[PDB]
Amino acid sequence: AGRAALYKEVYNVIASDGSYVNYRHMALLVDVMTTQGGLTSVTRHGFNRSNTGALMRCSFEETVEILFEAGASAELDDCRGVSENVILGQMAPIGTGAFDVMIDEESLVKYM
Amino acid sequence: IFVYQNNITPSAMKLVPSIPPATIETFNEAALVVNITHHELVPKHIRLSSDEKRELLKRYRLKESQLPRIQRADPVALYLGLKRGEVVKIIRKSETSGRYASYRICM
Amino acid sequence: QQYSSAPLRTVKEVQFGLFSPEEVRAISVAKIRFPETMDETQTRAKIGGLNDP
Amino acid sequence: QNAQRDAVTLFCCLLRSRLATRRVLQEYRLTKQAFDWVLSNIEAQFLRSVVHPGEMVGVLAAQSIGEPATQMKVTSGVPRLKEILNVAKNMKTPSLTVY
Amino acid sequence: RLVKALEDIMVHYDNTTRNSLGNVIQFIYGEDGMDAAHIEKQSLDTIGGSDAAFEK
Amino acid sequence: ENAATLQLGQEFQLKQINHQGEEEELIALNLSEARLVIKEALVERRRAFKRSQKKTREKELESIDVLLEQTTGGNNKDLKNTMQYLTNFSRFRDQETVGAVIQLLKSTGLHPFEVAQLGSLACDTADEAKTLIPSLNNKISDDELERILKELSNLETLY
């Protein structure tokens, strides 16, 4: 019910000036703000307090405090986030980079 | 099921865990005056069995923590008495699609 | 920039554990004991100090 | 299978409403070949309309929610969006509606 | 703030929007799984119309 | 630390992983089996090269040397030295003998390293065998050890 009310309020405020936004975006926003047990506010005290990649939260406003917390807790980062790959300068698992391209040695012979 | 009129003293709250095998839930008279499920905003919540949970995890290939979380003190959870590690299916009506089915696991 | 024989492969995970003093000593090739960043005449860097070669 | 059927329930209702026998025969005069071509085109367009895997849904949603705010009794506009996004324990202009 | 919060959410080949941790935000992208661009405003005849109109 | 007290390293575990992920038991081989597998590999390499290009201590050594030179020859000089070391003081010259030896060692069910040493190293007395491998002291009965030792001695080829 809280998620539905939040979505309705978002739709009302967006449509107050007449602008139109597709329902899917609002649904995704409310879902991410409500994916946890409660409502995760979009602030440095909300989603930034989750257990996501340390570098991903580092890029937010809290930069060195999160690093100290990770060092104290020895947090492990799987580098599946966008920020981790961007910092590492590697193709992130995004769209083209989500998958990988290989070579078929059996089709090559017949295609030649 | 035990329902109180005004409030519950902390002594009863700490005594409730004294009986593991028997689960006791405390509800307020004011809270239960009007049924929450009858509200339009709240979707339809259906409890899922352990076998259903295992099948869902196998098909979607999810772990316990990957599923959406729901607070223990959530009014819906208290209404259904959901326990820890229990998955509940939520069927909702939306404008973009006729219905949508999600799942929530208590934390 | 320069040919290297080491295998090339992107990083997949990054642990953020603490840096032990023993590991610091083991990896610290040199020692710093001279506050001056340069030697006399400002020609050579202080040996065993800041900006050591 | 149940999830797939549930997802396309609205589109199935749309097809039944539009591809009705009365409409196809009374409102429309499609033939066998024309009807088959229509079915094939509808199927192809629906398959193309499927969400492309790997698309950054989150970033698109963020941009779509942020652009109207930049373009733009009871609090509304940017302050209302900021309050909604934040926890907003205290309400500047709380309201309630009862029918 | 919105970009930072939604940066890690992506739709996978299973048609589920998941973040870096893998938590499923939505089992179906927008409850439909269709592409946002292809969506368009269309009228439903079943919802409208009277009983006599629906019958005829 | 690696020693003879079965304190193998982090990688020399009793179990090994397979290309398909299946777990198998470590398998060892003796000098004769090593020579046999090396010869089979050389024959396979020679056959591969041929198909790709198409479209008594005095004679065997020369054949082995020329075969090594023809394929995988000149890349490294250590291969020839290892081949000479294996061939000069080998024990079994027939595939049947090594097959029987490995089949008999299979029934024992001991550690692959221990059975490999027993089939390769030569012993004549129980005390000598025990002092050779003190770790494998209270594992094999004296009668069984003597029987396997005499069987191995009898199976030795007469060159």
Next chain:
Amino acid sequence: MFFIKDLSLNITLHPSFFGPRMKQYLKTKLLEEVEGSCTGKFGYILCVLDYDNIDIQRGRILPTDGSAEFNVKYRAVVFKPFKGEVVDGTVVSCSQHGFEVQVGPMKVFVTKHLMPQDLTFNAGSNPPSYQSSEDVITIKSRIRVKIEGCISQVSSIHAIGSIKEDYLGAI
């Protein structure tokens, strides 16, 4: 010590070499690496078997570079000495500090202090040899010695041994 195990090798190939023969070429590069390899981690690689049955996994394409990285898993036999083992070798050279013994692809050195009292070095013969009350040692001799220490080099392995227990030495 004569152990057969599965090894995975990553090989980089330029996209220009993409014809049908590339496989063979790849195999050639495999033959130029496994042969002669000597790493402390995996020890010394002796041989690779089942050449025709070698299976190559699908190549990996770099995100930006056109090179293809193939991970090939192959069964190979390798040799690695262990402390306390006894092995037989042939004397290759003589010196005042001792005589080096070539065993397989490796060398073994015997400490002078750990030699029999009867055994004594002698330079009266060309080349210098060792004389014992009941044994004779020369350049061309099969000597069985116990290995007590192992040293790992970049591309070599050395052993330090001694001959004190009975039944050791010339055989």
Next chain:
Amino acid sequence: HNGAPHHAIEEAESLLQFHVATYMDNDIAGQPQALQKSGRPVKSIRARLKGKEGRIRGNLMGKRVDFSARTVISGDPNLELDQVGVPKSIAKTLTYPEVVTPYNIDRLTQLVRNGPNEHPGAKYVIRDSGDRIDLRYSKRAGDIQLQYGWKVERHIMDNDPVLFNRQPSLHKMSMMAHRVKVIPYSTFRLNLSVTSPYNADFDGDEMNLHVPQSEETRAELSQLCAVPLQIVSPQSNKPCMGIVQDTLCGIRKLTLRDTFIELDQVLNMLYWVPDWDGVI
């Protein structure tokens, strides 16, 4: 080592702790900040990682680019929707490392012979070893024979995809690929319609152009983010880019039932349409 009174020892230890804390974190809440010898606070590692100026958001999330240009934009009705005008000077400065191939060996050799000064040319020829040789500094540029596997930094030519963006990238459609069209002027020129997705106003607005430096990047830009593909906006599932103000007024006036056109103007309008079938 010279006797420990235990009184000054505490002061020395506190001073050392303060210095270490300032080095690791110059800004400590409710404590004095160490002052550098000069008239500025001492910069610490924690300060070096704080935000915009920090390495996290100053050098990792957003970092400077080598191959790129920035300059004013001007309207151009005579340019295609996906075609963007580019100054000749910017085109000469910006280069693409095209690898030498037999298919275009002659074209690359001609470009090298032209030289960096001439716009249809190149400024560098990367050899197989990787060393770069400058053409302007070398007087024997025409004597260099290209070989397969080498790379040449050729000036951007026509039909060369390049990303165009404006600094306030509020929405997704603020950065789109355009086909380069070399023009003899110092101002970027883009289609009238693409102003709407960019929110361009031509009142001195400055935009940025980024040139891809690899085949992968070119293919991704052409196939993923292309203006023709960006016409439909997922934000409102409707075309964000459409007709422009003056064009809208002109088309409205043309469509009026009382509007009639002479034969000459009709023929000219028919000819203007490049894809006109040919039948009047």
Next chain:
Amino acid sequence: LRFGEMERDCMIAHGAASFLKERLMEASDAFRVHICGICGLMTVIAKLNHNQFECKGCDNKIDIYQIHIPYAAKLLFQELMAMNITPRLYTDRS
């Protein structure tokens, strides 16, 4: 020019991962750093001319892998090391 965060997320939405990798690793500062397979620390002694690889922290001889990352990444890693924080770069998933 500066590749802003807004442009970064816009390109992420576009899905051009290759473009972003090239922009942040080729068109920008580019460095190649060596890391051990056990300690995962950039402090590895690598003489390319002599082709000699050895890390003082861990008693290893040949366990070194090369990774291409922006100079800013290694600068941040060194700064964290100064704060007794060690980003252990590993090429495999545990």
Next chain:
Amino acid sequence: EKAIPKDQRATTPYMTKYERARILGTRALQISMNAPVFVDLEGETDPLRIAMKELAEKKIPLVIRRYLPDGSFEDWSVEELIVDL
């Protein structure tokens, strides 16, 4: 064990736009590096056009690894994929 067999694949057989762009870019990069061409060239030199023609003729021998969030990967050949664009 993570690898899924060729059959029983839940991914969409139809080609995705991101996959098409990646395949075209990889083919163009390979061709630019003097890679073999499986389709006769009729006076064409642009690598992108050659890659598009090969994709149309399904002569591209590349592969696509559909990676599930858990880690399992499914292999798909370019020939079997359907290009709706």
Next chain:
DNA sequence: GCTTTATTGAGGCTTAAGCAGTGGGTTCCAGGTACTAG
């Protein structure tokens, strides 16, 4: 019957956050004081 407890909560103070990009014109080599070399 009285005394001493664990608990509940409620605010002061505190430490944090604070659109993106880019063009330009000015200023710092810091002040005094004592000790010592030519």
Next chain:
DNA sequence: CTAGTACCTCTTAAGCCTCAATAAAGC
């Protein structure tokens, strides 16, 4: 005598400690 050289100098979100009441256990 004279001049180097260095040494001193506006609007919210979470944590925590500090306050005022309250039912039970000791005795």
